[PDB]
Every structure is written in C-alpha cells, then in structure tokens.
Amino acid sequence: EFDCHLSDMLQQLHSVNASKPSERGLVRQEEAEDPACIPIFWVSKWVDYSDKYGLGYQLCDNSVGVLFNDSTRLILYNDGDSLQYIERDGTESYLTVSSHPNSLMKKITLLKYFRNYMSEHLLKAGANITRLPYLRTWFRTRSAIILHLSNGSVQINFFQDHTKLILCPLMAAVTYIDEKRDFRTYRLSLLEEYGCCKELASRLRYARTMVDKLLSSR
C-alpha cells in the first residue's frame, strides 16, 4: 500500500496516544525534544480559493504552489522562474515562466495571483526558525486545515489558537508550534516515555483522527 507514509504515521500516533502521555504524573516534556528531527519543509502560508480555482500555498523555503480543482499541481521554485508541473497521473515536468509556455499560461497567471496575495496579506508561519514536496491533498474542518505533503509530512493548522502540528513519519517526529509562536520538535517515542501536557496530547488525538480521514479517502 503506497499511501505516502500515512499508515506508518497512524501507527506512530496510535502508539503514543495509547500510552496516555498526559497522565504520567511525573511529566518531563523537555526530555523528548530532538533538534535533529527539525523539519525542512512545512506550509508557511495558504489561501483557499477552492470554489473557483484551487488551494494556493507557500512553503517555508519561499516556493509557492497551487493544487488546482482539476487535481494538477503547479509549483514555482524560490528563484521566481523555475516551474514544476504535476499532471493528473503523477507525471512531472519542468519548465520556466520566462519561456512563456502557451500550455500553462492561465495556471501560471493564477499561481502568480496567489503568490502576490500571500506576500501582501499573510504572515509567514514558522518564520522565527531555519526533494521539494508538493501538496498531495488537503481538507478543512471547523477546527483546522489538514495538509498532506508528498514527502509524507502532515501539517495541521488549528484556526482557533493558531497552534500547528507538523508530523514527519520518516523521523517518527512531531513539531509543535504553540500560541506564543514557540517551536518545538519531539520524538513521538520519547513522548510515550516522558509524557506531555494535556494540550499537545489532545492535538495528537485529533491528528490520529485526521490521518484516518486521509486514509479513508484515497
């Protein structure tokens, strides 16, 4: 089953949640940190225009992408000129804006509209910290937006309090961005051992459920 690491992520989340890390008593959350699992990629900005066009987003490396409603993806690298186009069937090709390709004129123009909106009206998430993936799929609930990247990472942005989770199954790690914009990366195995606060635990339970929904909609 090639489900872009979701089954692994779900396994990792079941085990930690099953351990009931908020009940430990003697809780030592700091001992579960591991800055060697700090993620390289996450979504720093997003704009949902899914009624008409698609979902536009910026990655922390300043590349921008769009997942169109026709289920193709266009990625503009941070050089502002190199494009990666992912067709319906997963087939990838590379081009440049400057070659002014008839084929992708409309989709490039849209990506540029998204790009400019984000630069003028949105703030960069994770800004206070230092292969290029595309957005595989996303959905939103009343409480959050869930973004699944092609590298297996799942990001969950909670609207309410602006907290964010970035789950990386390759490292069996989770990064938590709290309301104060503080940024902490944990090994899930070590959260099972040392435990955590009710807040992070609750969001990890929520994450399991969101990963289930992603797996249920392939």
Considering only 47, 59, 125, 171, the residue that binds ligand Z24 (CB under 6 A) is 47
Considering only 49, 68, 139, 183, the residue that binds ligand Z24 (CB under 6 A) is 49
Please report how close the Cβ of residue 110 comes to ligand Z24 at its closest, in angstroms: 6
Using the minimum distance from each CB to ligand Z24, give the nearer residue, 68 or 139: 68
How many chain residues bind ligand Z24 (CB under 6 A)?
6
Please report how close the Cβ of residue 62 comes to ligand Z24 at its closest, in angstroms: 17
- Burial (CB < 10 A; 0-12, 13-18, 19+), residue 50, is middle
User: Residue 205's CB: how many other CB atoms inside 10 A?
Assistant: 13
User: Residue 159's CB: how many other CB atoms inside 10 A?
Assistant: 12
Using the minimum distance from each CB to ligand Z24, give the nearer residue, 108 or 211: 108
The β-bridge partners of 73 are 67, 86
Only segment of 36-44, 111-119, 147-155, 176-184 that touches ligand Z24 (CB under 6 A) = 111-119
Spell out, one character per residue from 75 to 94, where the chain touches ligand Z24: x when CB under 6 A holds, - when not: --------------------
Considering only 68, 117, 158, 183, the residue that binds ligand Z24 (CB under 6 A) is 117
Element (H, E) at 190: helix 188-194
Q: Which residue has the tokens 């266009």?
A: 74
Using the minimum distance from each CB to ligand Z24, give the nearer residue, 106 or 218: 106
Considering only 57, 85, 114, 138, the residue that binds ligand Z24 (CB under 6 A) is 114
Q: Which residue has the tokens 């969101």?
A: 210
Applying CB under 6 A, the residues found at the interface with ligand Z24 are 47, 49, 52, 113-114, 117
